[PDB]
Design a protein around this ligand. Structure first.
Ligand SMILES: Nc1ncnc2c1ncn2[C@@H]1O[C@H](COP(=O)(O)OP(=O)(O)O)[C@@H](O)[C@H]1O
Ligand SMILES: [Mg+2]
Length: 758
């Protein structure tokens, strides 16, 4: 075991770097320290405070500056004994207060260790620097060992999830969730990879066929789904749910993927300094004049879906060659030659529909002084150019009982084409998922290691509809970890030789989970999906009802004191104000109907299958006709949670270092404020509710029995032996609650013997 080998990098990389000695002749003082934040204002940003007299209430001070301010007995965030700093399970801690939490990891992150265990949650802060914790030799270690057995590292979360699958014979699920850019996909990508060797199908070391088939799906799910943004460069327009399929005899079979809402509108809008889908900025470089010609193409700047952005290039990124990498992960999936010209050549239309400009002069009606640019979409789509517009400008619309071709004004006209776009990108993203799925996921399935990555509720300036959705989730998945731990808090509840007094919770987050989704009495998507069908009433009247029902009667809600387009719900993180622009127009999500009418018929096997194959456009039944996008979401959701309500979960709370995207500095502002709102802290403050500090009971008796020369170094049954240092150091029965295998020395008075004397 390289762990023996001191030199073996794993010591310097993932471990605090155990020092030579293990005795009391080491880290030494005898006093007590408390965390104080010197400014009577700014909360975050604490500083070391010294204690002067542990009085009944008035805690005594000596500020780093040397002052004498005095806080109460119950608000002075005290500071953990140093024997501990940079310890793997934050649970081990005897004081869990925001500073005393941000400290134990500031330091470890500081020593180049990014991974620290906390209760269950593997917390990991994002480096931004390239670190060698991923080599095969790495794989080789965390293999077949216990969480405690070896280092805090992602590989552990899985090997564990892995053996587990085949020792209980139930499917499992890893959950990587947290702040944007915060890095889920970098680990989510390294776990699947661990799933590549420990259970790796390769007969001989490496991979065979399914492995790369499965391994180069990503380049794909990225060049089309992923965008650069303000908080990342590999930002994820959607979310995903990949499970890995094995047999009863220990090996991989096929696999899975489950995408959610794309940033479908980003296709047509790139805020300053943010780019459109990555594939767009590749197909224009990694090709030839037999490809630009093959599909009318000018340099990646002439397109008004790419320049309006304010940026194209990516510091340190061969967009040009980044394209090759993705064309091979196609070939491997058996992506055929005709199969790629079509995906792209079908993308290329979406570029052009952009260089098309709706002019206007027939009184008020848009027209086209230039047919050239359409001459391509009609061209590369292989549809009607005359109707393409003729269905564009004057579509037939049913007003009452009559079929009457209208003519949208200079504005509603272009706007309508702008719909024919997400349509290709949604349906096209969609078909790329169906396709992988087909060549990867088998039928005779057995166990699964479900990996889902999707975004924690992050709060922002405008919060359009799309988001009321992705908190709906982090409100649901948040309730889960809340509930699951309760049912597990019954177990150790059965065997300690005494079974504690029934404890209940229920999660008050339930009131809000209704506010959003409730049928009777109805909630946001309920009264929303009601007006989504009347095609006359508008936002103002809608943002007006969500105030009728709730303003002043429903606790978790806040009508805007002033704005008449806002409204505010309150989540597991707190208040959020939402917008009402097109909420109606989008749950509704329409598109003029002579378009599916005219596209349904094409020269393509992939242009046509998207408008003709209901496994693509249609939803399920209800309203009187095809259901609505928020309706779909609510049902498609529980299909998942009720798909974890049978497996063993595995959690990963991801944490970002700074919103500046730079390595080697930890904002004591950003980081500490991803902490307090997310349950990571919260699910262990709860279990502390008794004694947060719990241990294997092999250590304490070796960790402290000489300050009381009564219990030895090698006593065999401390069950009858470690006792002799309690009736001599003197810990009252309330002062702790031990166990018959493990122990948890008092919820509070523990350091009075842990940091001071032998
Ligand atoms: N543990 C890590 N080591 C090195 N780089 C990382 C690590 N975690 C994240 N990154 C980098 O941070 C960037 C953002 O992380 P990412 O995994 O893409 O998060 P997300 O998908 O949530 O936006 C990535 O482009 C990646 O380069
Ligand atoms: Mg991702």
């Amino acid at each position: 075991n390289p762990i023996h080998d001191r030199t073996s990098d794993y010591h310097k990389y993932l471990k605090v770097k155990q020092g030579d000695s293990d005795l009391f002749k080491l880290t030494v003082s005898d006093k007590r320290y408390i965390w104080y934040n010197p400014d009577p204002k700014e909360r975050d940003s604490y500083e070391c405070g010294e204690i002067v007299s542990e009085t009944s209430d008035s805690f005594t001070f000596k500020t780093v500056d040397g002052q004498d301010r005095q806080v109460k007995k119950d608000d002075a965030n005290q500071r953990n004994p140093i024997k501990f700093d940079g310890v793997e399970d934050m649970s081990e801690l005897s004081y869990l207060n925001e500073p005393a939490v941000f400290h134990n990891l500031r330091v470890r992150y500081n020593q180049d260790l990014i991974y620290t265990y906390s209760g269950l949650f593997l917390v990991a802060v994002n480096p931004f620097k390239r670190i060698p914790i991923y080599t095969q030799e790495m794989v080789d270690i965390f293999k077949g060992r216990r969480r405690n057995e070896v280092a805090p590292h992602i590989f552990a979360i899985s090997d564990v999830a892995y053996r587990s699958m085949l020792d209980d014979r139930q499917n499992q699920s890893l959950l990587i969730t947290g702040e944007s850019g915060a890095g889920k996909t970098e680990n989510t990508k390294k776990v699947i990879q661990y799933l590549a060797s420990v259970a790796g199908r390769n007969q001989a070391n490496g991979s065979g066929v399914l492995e790369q088939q499965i391994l180069q799906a990503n380049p794909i799910l990225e060049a089309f789904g992923n965008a650069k943004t303000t908080r990342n460069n590999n930002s994820s327009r959607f979310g995903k749910f990949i499970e890995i399929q094995f047999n009863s005899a220990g090996f991989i079979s096929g696999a899975s993927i489950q995408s959610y809402l794309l940033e479908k509108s980003r296709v047509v809008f790139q805020s300053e300094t943010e780019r459109n889908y990555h594939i767009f900025y590749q197909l224009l470089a990694g090709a030839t004049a037999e490809e630009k010609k093959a599909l009318h193409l000018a340099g990646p700047e002439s397109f008004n879906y790419l320049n309006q952005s304010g940026c194209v290039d990516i510091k340190g990124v061969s967009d040009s060659e980044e394209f090759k990498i993705t064309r091979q992960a196609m070939d491997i999936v058996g992506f055929s030659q005709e199969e790629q010209m079509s995906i792209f050549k079908i993308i290329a239309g979406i570029l052009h529909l952009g260089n098309i400009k709706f002019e206007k002069g027939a009184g008020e009606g848009a027209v086209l002084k230039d047919k050239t640019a359409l001459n391509a979409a009609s061209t590369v789509f292989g549809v009607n150019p005359s109707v393409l517009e003729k269905a564009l400008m004057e579509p037939r619309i049913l007003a009452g009982r009559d079929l009457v071709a209208q003519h949208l004004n200079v504005e509603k006209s272009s706007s309508s084409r702008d719909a024919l776009v997400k349509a290709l990108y949604g349906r096209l993203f969609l078909w790329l998922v169906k396709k992988i799925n087909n060549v990867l996921c088998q039928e005779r399935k057995a166990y699964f290691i479900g990996v889902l990555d999707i975004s924690g509720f992050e709060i922002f300036k405008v919060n359009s509809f799309e988001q009321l959705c992705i908190n709906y989730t982090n409100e649901k998945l948040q309730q889960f970890f809340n509930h699951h731990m309760f049912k597990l808090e019954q177990e150790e509840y059965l065997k300690e030789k005494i079974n504690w007094t029934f404890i209940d919770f229920g999660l008050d987050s339930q009131a809000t989970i209704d506010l959003i989704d409730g049928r009777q009495p109805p909630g946001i998507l309920a009264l929303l999906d009601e007006q989504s069908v009347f095609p006359n009433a508008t936002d103002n009247t809608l943002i007006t009802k969500l105030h009728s029902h709730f303003s002043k009667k429903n606790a978790k809600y806040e009508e805007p004191r002033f704005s008449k387009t806002e409204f505010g719900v309150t989540h597991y993180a707190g208040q959020v104000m939402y917008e009402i622009q097109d909420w109606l127009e989008k749950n509704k999500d329409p598109l003029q109907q002579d378009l599916e009418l005219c596209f349904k018929d094409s020269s393509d096997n992939v242009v046509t299958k998207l408008f003709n194959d209901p496994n693509i456009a249609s939803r399920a039944k209800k309203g009187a006709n095809f259901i609505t996008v928020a309706a779909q979401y609510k049902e498609q959701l529980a299909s998942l949670m009720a798909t974890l309500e049978t497996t063993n979960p595995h959690f990963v709370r991801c944490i970002i270092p700074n919103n500046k995207q730079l390595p080697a500095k930890l904002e004591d502002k950003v980081v500490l404020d991803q902490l307090r709102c997310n349950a990571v802290l919260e699910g262990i403050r709860i279990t502390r509710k008794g004694f947060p500090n719990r241990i294997i009971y092999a250590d304490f008796v070796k960790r402290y029995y000489l300050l009381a020369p009564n219990v030895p170094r090698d006593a065999e049954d401390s069950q009858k032996a470690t006792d002799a240092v309690l009736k001599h150091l003197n810990i009252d029965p309330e002062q702790y609650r031990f166990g018959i295998t493990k122990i948890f020395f008092r919820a509070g008075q523990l350091a009075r013997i842990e940091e001071a004397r032998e």
